[PDB]
Structure formats: structure tokens, C-alpha cells
Design a protein around this ligand. Structure first.
Ligand SMILES: Cc1ncc(COP(=O)(O)O)c(CN[C@@H](CC(=O)O)C(=O)O)c1O
Ligand SMILES: Cc1ncc(COP(=O)(O)O)c(CN[C@@H](CC(=O)O)C(=O)O)c1O
Lengths: 396, 396
């Protein structure tokens, strides 16, 4: 039965991890996966998290199944994070949240839901975008079309192109937007641009699907939700796939949410019963651990204050690494001018490196980046900044 | 876009929990969902589990992503549980295990894999079976056909009927078996019957798909895997969907495994690469907590010893409740004979109650059973036994 199955091509992102490990080169540097690192190059469990975990250990009396949609507090806290404490979506009860296994699981739950219960046939993703977007959607039977976004030469957001390409999108098409910290460009629309996009979408009849995985890594929790919020004031229907993987340093616990918004409470509820049916035929109900942690932290003033500070620290230090990279590149002989890098938000920078340059860095130098030239700035430290910057220079 | 969405019928199993969790009656009794309850009526976190969790809290230094297939030691530990220490399957490197979100997650991953990488079109499932089996397969695009199984008149396994029914299956078809503790009948084949079925299946060219969610609840760990091992000795290929939800009391942490077996290692490796691709487009990678627990416990001699005892205590208490049920029923002057119930294994009992009787039991008496008349014997207690038996007797 399996004799003729051919091997799958490795994951452009996840597969680097394989290589990196299997690599013996002593000074090897990993800038692949989007995982936060500290000054010492380790990915620590957050303090607020360890504390939340101690609490659960002492207070948990059962492992009894959660509901299909998971923990209620969890959904409630997510809605406030997303839409704002006294939002109308919340008061009007137009939103329903399901706790999912990571942001990926949320993306997938949305896909399965759309495919099975709506007339959606295609989803529009930016060029470039996170490679796994194609895969999740295709998996649900949806077609993926691309819209223009990035301007390589100017290293900017090509609004014109963005706008004309999206002109090919039909009413009833799903359009995927990155909440903040565009992966992999780091270029985000301004608020006016968000506002513009929000009207076109309403005028053109698209169904917005927001991929929100880096809330807090650009400017702040509330600031980062502006675009989304702009969309939320205008749209009747919305889908939000969010992740707590990065902002809580909870990568392997699979914590995310799929938020469903409709015109009214009765509608959203009916639609949501189908979303639950889709979850049930997938993984049945969500993993309690990680989401327990998040709800514990968000619902406790003290633990929360600590959390917000830890996130602020992650963010500023990435920012520090951005400036240091540019400078080091600078006085290490860079032919090119990498200063655009300072203007990107989040954990990565699109270096502008060729596929062959990345190949080489890896082969000759032990430096691991994604084929697309995406580098994980948050993987950079003062101790690895030099060797790394020499490598790059040697390949320009 | 969602205006036309129609509301999903509630889950026959999962939905009972809601009903149950909503009637304000004082002595209601939940016999629905398959969760273990102790003499006091609770589903405590196991001791071996709390212990492993403490270790984790103290020892974990990171929450960084696990590989797509999860924790290696977890998979290793699973294979031995399934196949036995020193199996050839193991020795020949014929099997690969992916850690998944529960048994449901593994059943679904197996479905997506089959549907995209093989020529499979139909899956044969017993009648009756767990109602979600249909939902899962159907969602991967596979057709579900049913084979005869239970003899309701006599309360036995209708072997010839089962065999004659399956003669309708084609080579290349997927046939699904319950490892032990058939849900919902509690009737399992004998070892000879298992052997028979194993030979046939090889001659007929079926792909065996095992759903193993109660290892340890019939007779014990090792003996509950006989059927499966009988199959594994004859077959070149097979798929195993296992769950650690019940035997570890880890319901909400979603812990299971999907094991793929092929003729050889080169072969099995190739197919596995495809199975990983299917995970990546679903949930990406699995939740660490629960599997970490299981592996810690299985890898530690002391912890293992304690766990195995907790498991035998669960099993024997159910056995006790089953005798008690039958007796009290008797002592309460029940119309029929309910002695077959003693011959069934696992957490449930196929009562023989009609739709309308289960329905009445609930409105009238607040006793909750699944519409098929399936009763959770593990939710039975010496304190709830009388009232419950009085309710049953009254509806008959
Ligand atoms: C834009 C985007 N969406 C969703 C996800 C998935 O989040 P969860 O891990 O919560 O499921 C990621 C993770 N992107 C990372 C890691 C990865 O691809 O696995 C990245 O390195 O791009 C992401 O970058
Ligand atoms: C035969 C069978 N297979 C797979 C599973 C799924 O197990 P996981 O919870 O590990 O995903 C169950 C759980 N059946 C229970 C619970 C349920 O239906 O949700 C039951 O009450 O039948 C089961 O009975």
C-alpha cells in the first residue's frame, strides 16, 4: 500500500532545524525558525509562566476533558486582547472564540470551517508570506492566489501594487492579512493604510482572515491591534487566527485561538456550532496546559504585570539587535546598504540575500537562514554578531 | 457570508455534557462520556502524573518547539507498549510514531495521510462503533462502510456475520478494528478470532487500522495488545491510532500516537515524511505537556510501578461496579436479565435500553446515558447505584 509513496520535500522552515542539529560545525549559528533567544542564546521559560505553572500544579484537581471550544476565560481574555476591553463586538456578543492547538491549528480550523460551510473557493495570501499558509489552505481544499505586497528594491510596502492585484479578488473571496509583524517582510501597513484596506474590503465584499501571531512584538499589545480594530469597526464578519506561541514563549504547548465574528449573536452562534463540529472531527478538544497558563496570567493582575514586562523586554532587545546588526555589517565591510533593516518590525528581517548566498552561508559558514533570505534577528546576540556579520560579508 | 449557515446537530456524546451541566436537579447522574470516576465520584489527577508534573516544573528550561512528530522517547515508549519489548517491528526499524493531540488527532492524521498519499477510498467501521469515527474519516474525504459485529439478541460477537459482511471489502480497502474494549459493545474477539481475522485480512488485501484507546482496561497492558500483535506478525503494513487519555487520566492534555508500519525502514521512512507533511498543515507540531508526562512516567521505573498500580485499581473498580450493577438491578426487581453486562469489558455497557427509555431516564430522573443505550460503568458509584437502578427499573 505504501510502496509507491514518494518522500516529501522538507519544510523550508522546520527542516532547517533538522540540518542544524545534525551539523557538527562548532561555531554554527541558527537564524531560521522564529524563536526568541536571549543574550545567552537560550529560549527560556518566562517567569510569569513558571509561576502560573506552579499554581496549576497545586490547584488542579482533574484532567477531565475541556469543551470543544476549550476554556471560557481563555476565550474571554483573547477577545479583550484582540478587540479592546469595552469593545462593541464583545458587548453585542458577536464573537465566539475556540481555543486551538497553536495559531496553525486556528488557521486550519478556519479553513475546514470555511470550506465546509461557506461558498468560499479561494483565499488570497500576500507575496511573500509564511510558506505554511499555502499548505493549510490547500489542505482544506481551498485555492490560494497571491497579492502583491513587498517592493524588493525599495524595501517597502507597495500599496499601489497591493491594491491593483487585489482588484482580481471576487466578492466572497477570503483575504488573509497579517495583524502586525509581516512574516517575512516585517513591513506593516500604516493605520491610514489599514483604514483604506478596511473600506475597500467592505466595498468589494471580501471576508477578512487575520493571522495574528506576533501581538506585542511591533509596538505594543494595543498598538499592534489597531489595523484589526479598524477592520472590526466596519466589518460585519471577520475571522481571527491568533497565537500565544511567541508572546508567551509557549511554543510547544500549542496555544492559539480562532475567533469568529458575525453580524449578530444568533448568527455567530449558529455558525460557531459548525466550527465546533469541524474541531470535533479533527482533534476533538484542546490541550489544557498552555491555555490554562495564559488564562491564569491574563486574569491575575500581578502575574499579568510581570508578563507584560517580560514581553516588553523581548521586544526591545530584538530592536537592539536590529541596530547592532546593521552597524556591525556596516563596519565590517558591507558592500550594500542594509539600513532598511532598521525599519522592519518583529523577529525577522528580509536581508535581500539571494538563494545561493543563503546556501553558501550555511555550507561554508555554518550560518542558518531561510532560503528566502529571512533572518531571525531575535536569534542574534552580541556574542554571535561578529562571526555572523563576517560570514554575510564574505558572501556579498 | 454566514447568514445561511445551518446549525450543527449536537454531539451525541460531547453534547450530553452540556445538557448535564445545565439542569439544576439535585441528584442527577452522568453516565455519558467515557471518563473514569472514583468511589467519591471524581476524576482525579493520577498520583504518578502529579509527580511527573512536578519534575517537569523543576526541570524544564524551555518551551521551544518540538519536532513535527513530537518527543522521541515518547514514540519509543509507545512502540514497546504496542508491540512489546524486542519486537521485530522495532528491531527492523519498521515503525515510525508521531505524537498527536489525542486518539482523535491520530485517527485524523491517519485519514489525511491515507487520503492524500494512497489510493484508499473507503474505510470499514463496525456497527455499532464510536460515532466520531464516521465524522473523522468523512472529513478527510473517505467513504465509510459498515461491517456487522454485535449480536444484540444474544449479546455476543456475531463472528460469521462479521466475516460475511467484510467479504464485501476490496483489496486496498481500509478496515478499522478496536484494539480492546470495543466501544460501545465491550465485546472483543478472542485471540483465535483475532488470528482468523489476521489471516483473512492478509489474503483479502485489507489495510488494518487499529484504534487503541483503552490499553490496560480489559485484562492488562500486555494482554490487551494480543490481537494487535497477531496482526503485526502477519502484516507488512498497518496503522495504529492510540490514546493515552484514559489509561493516564490525561483527558484534557490530548495525548496519543499515530504509528505507521511498512514492509521495511526505507519504505516506512518515505511514507512517514508524508505523514509529517500532513501534521504540519494541520496543527504544525504537538503539545508537549501531556506527552512529556507519559514519557517521564514510562521512562522511570519507580513512577512506572506506581502508574501501573493506579491503572489496575481503575480497572478493578470498574469490574466491581459491573457486578454491583447487575445485582442491584436484580434486587430492584428488573424485568429482564442483565447478566451479559458482566461479560463486557472496558468503561461501558451496552444496556439494551431503547431510545425512548434513555430519553425518559433523563427527563424524568436526571440519569444521563448516550442515546444508543451505552452506559458509563466507570461513573457508577456505591452511592449512586441505588437511585440509578431504581430509575432504570422504572422505565422498563
Ligand atoms: C505568520 C505566522 N502564522 C502562524 C504561525 C504558526 O504559529 P503557531 O506556532 O502558534 O502555530 C507562525 C509561526 N511561524 C514561525 C514558526 C513556524 O513556521 O513554525 C516561523 O518561523 O515563521 C507564523 O509566523
Ligand atoms: C474508541 C475510541 N476511540 C478514540 C477515542 C478518542 O480519544 P481521545 O479523547 O484520546 O481523543 C475515544 C474516546 N471516546 C470517549 C470520549 C469521546 O467520545 O470524546 C467516549 O465517550 O466514547 C474512543 O472511545
Amino acid at each position: 500500500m505504501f510502496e509507491n509513496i514518494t518522500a516529501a520535500p522538507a519544510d523550508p522552515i522546520l527542516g532547517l532545524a533538522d540540518l542544524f542539529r545534525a551539523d557538527e560545525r562548532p561555531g554554527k549559528i541558527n537564524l531560521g525558525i522564529g524563536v526568541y533567544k536571549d543574550e545567552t542564546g537560550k529560549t527560556p521559560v518566562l517567569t510569569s509562566v513558571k509561576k502560573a505553572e506552579q499554581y496549576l500544579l497545586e490547584n488542579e484537581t482533574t484532567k477531565n476533558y475541556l469543551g470543544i471550544d476549550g476554556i471560557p476565560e481563555f476565550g474571554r481574555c483573547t477577545q479583550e486582547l484582540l478587540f479592546g476591553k469595552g469593545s462593541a463586538l464583545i458587548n453585542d456578543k458577536r464573537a465566539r472564540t475556540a481555543q486551538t492547538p497553536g495559531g496553525t491549528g486556528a488557521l486550519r480550523v478556519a479553513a475546514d470551517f470555511l470550506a465546509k460551510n461557506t461558498s468560499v473557493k479561494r483565499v488570497w495570501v500576500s507575496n511573500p508570506s509564511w510558506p505554511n499558509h499555502k499548505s493549510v489552505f490547500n489542505s482544506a481544499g481551498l485555492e490560494v492566489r497571491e497579492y502583491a505586497y513587498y517592493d524588493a528594491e525599495n524595501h517597502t510596502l507597495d500599496f499601489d501594487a497591493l491594491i491593483n492585484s487585489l482588484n482580481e479578488a471576487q466578492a466572497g473571496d477570503v483575504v488573509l492579512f497579517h495583524g502586525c509583524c509581516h512574516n517575512p517582510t516585517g513591513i506593516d501597513p500604516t493605520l491610514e493604510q489599514w483604514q483604506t484596506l478596511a473600506q475597500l474590503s467592505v466595498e468589494k465584499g471580501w471576508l477578512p482572515l487575520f493571522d495574528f501571531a506576533y501581538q506585542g512584538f511591533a509596538r505594543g499589545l494595543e498598538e499592534d491591534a489597531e489595523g484589526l480594530r479598524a477592520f472590526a469597526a466596519m466589518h460585519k464578519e471577520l475571522i481571527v487566527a491568533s497565537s500565544y506561541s511567541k508572546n508567551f514563549g509557549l511554543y510547544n504547548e500549542r496555544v492559539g485561538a480562532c475567533t469568529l465574528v458575525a453580524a449578530d449573536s444568533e448568527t455567530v452562534d449558529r455558525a460557531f456550532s459548525q466550527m465546533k463540529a469541524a474541531i470535533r472531527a479533527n482533534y476533538s478538544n484542546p490541550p489544557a496546559h498552555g491555555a490554562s497558563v495564559v488564562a491564569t496570567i491574563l486574569s491575575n493582575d500581578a502575574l499579568r504585570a510581570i508578563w507584560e514586562q517580560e514581553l516588553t523586554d523581548m521586544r526591545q532587545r530584538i530592536q537592539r539587535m536590529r541596530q547592532l546588526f546593521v552597524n556591525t555589517l556596516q563596519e565590517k565591510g558591507a558592500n550594500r546598504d542594509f539600513s532598511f533593516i532598521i525599519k522592519q518590525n518583529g523577529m525577522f528581517s528580509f536581508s535581500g540575500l539571494t538563494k545561493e548566498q543563503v546556501l553558501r552561508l550555511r555550507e561554508e559558514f555554518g550560518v542558518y537562514a531561510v532560503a528566502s533570505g529571512r533572518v531571525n534577528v531575535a536569534g542574534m546576540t552580541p556574542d554571535n554578531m561578529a562571526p555572523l556579520c563576517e560570514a554575510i560579508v564574505a558572501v556579498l
